[PDB]
Ligand code: HEC
């Protein structure tokens with residue numbers, strides 16, 4: 001022990017533990033080795049290694065799975081939905097891709113919610129065909145009648161009621177006559193008469209069954225008043241994957 | 255990255271297809287100006303490098319220039335026992351026998367052959383009869399590109415050699431994209447052969463000797479620890 | 490010894506402790522890669538700058554990273570791996586340390602403003618399983634932008650290239666969405 005006490009405490013003069021010494025030295029040696037091996041070298045990466053490994057990771061991945069994607073690309077979207085080889089792998093992975101990228105807006109189920117379309121069902125705003133769906137995906141995605149003097153506070157109510165009749169039958173006589181007249185004038189141009197709707201515009205059919213969209217009179221009043229304005233963001237930048245996804249979405253209904 | 259070769263390390267005994275490609279390149283391109291006197295032709299059959307068929311060697315030899323004689327002045331048929339020819343002057347260059355050691359060596363040749371781009375935006379006119387290289391460092395530089403104290407602002411300098419190859423100068427019999435980069439690598443390896451043919455034997459000797467001497471040294475360490483035991487036991 | 494000497498011990502400690510800081514921090518000031526902005530990039534617009542401050546005030550950083558690592562899977566999930574140049578303007582830097590929620594670095598258009606509004610208003614509503622807190626107040630409070638000029642001026646002093654013109658020219662939910670929409674956009678378009 002050593003001669004000096006610090007309130008109670010005294011200290012033994014003992015040797016550093018051999019193992020402790022070894023580990024310390026080993027770490028140092030490893031460090032020098034690491035530095036020589038890293039930036040200051042290691043073989044396998046030409047030039048100098050860096051985060052450059054990223055390129056390698058992607059590249060090997062590309063070599064490994066390029067064929068699967070490339071095979072799919074040649075095939076038409078409709079074919080890529082049908083075929084369980086590509087087509088089935090396209091639904092599960094396309095379905096895989098779907099969960100990562102699309103599920104947050106269109107639901108894990110792809111059923112959708114208020115403000116987002118149900119991809120599973122039969123009804124398509126932009127058109128159900130393969131080309132249409134693909135386009136929706138690749139390049140991405142309602143006029144405010146409250147203001148247009150004529151529409152006003154009353155005109156909107158009437159049009160709302162009339163549309164609910166096109167969709168089904170509620171009972172409000174004033175909200176019907178007026179609305180029919182207005183729809184024929186304005187709405188019909190995009191939604192058609194009897195509300196078939198026009199896919200070109202992405203104008204949905206008014207003659208629909210109970211969907212997730214705000215069917216209620218009030219909600220219809222709001223969409224008519226203020227108008228719509230919904231976006232489907234383009235996956236061309238973010239996203240081959242777009243194609244598989246189109247195949248998956250197409251496969252979803254049927 | 256750095257495009258390391260095969261021999262760059264403790265192993266790598268001179269992948270021979272690469273050397274045959276470099277030979278296709280050297281005899282059809284570089285031989286027009288360069289030579290390799292320090293290289294016998296028969297070495298194209300010795301192991302380690304291109305283990306070509308001797309008969310083809312004799313044919314290729316007889317198909318070269320005429321090396322006259324040493325005893326009776328008379329243009330002979332140039333037997334393999336002689337050396338590669340020599341291009342000396344009047345628009346010709348040095349000997350490439352050991353150029354892979356007079357400079358990490360082959361990387362110099364690769365990154366030299368690689369790089370003859372147009373003149374930069376300091377002297378686009380350039381020079382008449384001289385062409386530009388981004389890696390040669392022993393060439394002239396115009397005064398427009400030098401700094402205030404004579405040092406050049408360019409990466410390389412102006413070399414008297416023209417660009418040796420275009421996009422697809424020659425065909426490979428084995429089947430391979432004969433772009434400029436692959437040809438450069440191949441010819442670099444061929445020159446390294448021409449300079450260090452006994453590389454693989456070097457490495458194998460090094461391995462054998464390291465092993466035997468490690469063994470001897472271990473045994474001597476045991477003998478020492480033993481002999482010096484009764485004198486290093488109480489402390 | 491130096492055990493006995495208070496000044497010596499203090500001095501050596503100060504010296505010993507300093508080397509790492511000098512070695513790591515100082516050279517960064519000098520290195521261009523970390524200094525250079527992406528070529529296309531401009532400073533945050535006044536609304537986006539205000540929104541960024543809101544993002545700071547709320548504590549979004551505590552759940553959301555803004556740094557994409559150079560791995561294939563994160564590239565796949567998030568997008569291009571973050572570059573130093575992207576963060577050049579960021580006083581202070583937003584890189585995360587934790588991802589309770591997903592990485593925000595490159596939401597350079599991924600979601601619509603409407604989605605962002607609904608989600609911020611109530612994350613559970615859009616994403617039922619979300620852990621994220623509801624931030625409805627963002628809708629409730631308006632921005633006065635009294636301070637925005639001062640903020641930009643200070644940032645300019647700090648090196649951000651705001652024009653005099655930019656300062657002069659300059660709801661909270663709106664600002665937050667505006668901020669979120671810019672993230673990672675600079676690289677993609679450039
Ligand atoms: C939130 C920003 C969404 C993202 C993420 C995804 N989708 Fe989307 N999509 C969204 C909306 C609000 C709409 C309706 C737009 C409108 O007309 O108002 C859509 C539409 C589609 C469609 C068209 C459906 C149709 O009826 O024709 C498709 C095919 C579609 N979305 C596909 C899709 C895919 C595959 C996605 C992941 C890559 C995806 N969407 C993401 C909102 C959002």
Ligand code: HEC
Pocket residue numbers: 279280283284285286287288345346347348353363366367390391393412413414415416418441
């Ligand atoms: C004449 C048309 C040439 C042919 C074809 C090739 N080379 Fe050459 N080379 C030539 C000259 C006149 C010079 C001297 C350049 C100078 O400025 O002094 C050279 C030089 C070289 C060198 C040496 C470079 C150095 O650093 O000194 C090398 C390594 C070299 N050349 C390689 C080379 C190869 C591989 C060729 C065939 C692909 C080749 N050269 C052809 C003239 C000519």
Ligand code: HEC
Pocket residue numbers: 125142143145159160163182183186187188189190191201202203204213214215220223224228229230231
């Ligand atoms: C031209 C473009 C028009 C005009 C003249 C009208 N509508 Fe609208 N409408 C249009 C589009 C492209 C969409 C889809 C909006 C989106 O998805 O973001 C709509 C939507 C509606 C809806 C909502 C359907 C739903 O709940 O999902 C309604 C109720 C609707 N439109 C009604 C409506 C009425 C009553 C109109 C005349 C006053 C009218 N639209 C005109 C495109 C267009």
Ligand code: HEC
Pocket residue numbers: 104544547548549550551552553589590591592593596599608609612613616618619620621622624665669
């Ligand atoms: C801790 C809990 C937080 C808090 C403090 C913040 N968020 Fe997030 N966030 C969190 C989770 C678990 C998720 C995933 C579930 C979901 O999407 O709701 C998110 C998600 C987001 C997103 C969407 C990211 C994406 O899917 O690409 C955004 C844009 C987002 N959060 C923004 C955001 C803002 C602005 C925050 C401060 C107000 C904020 N978050 C805080 C978890 C948490």
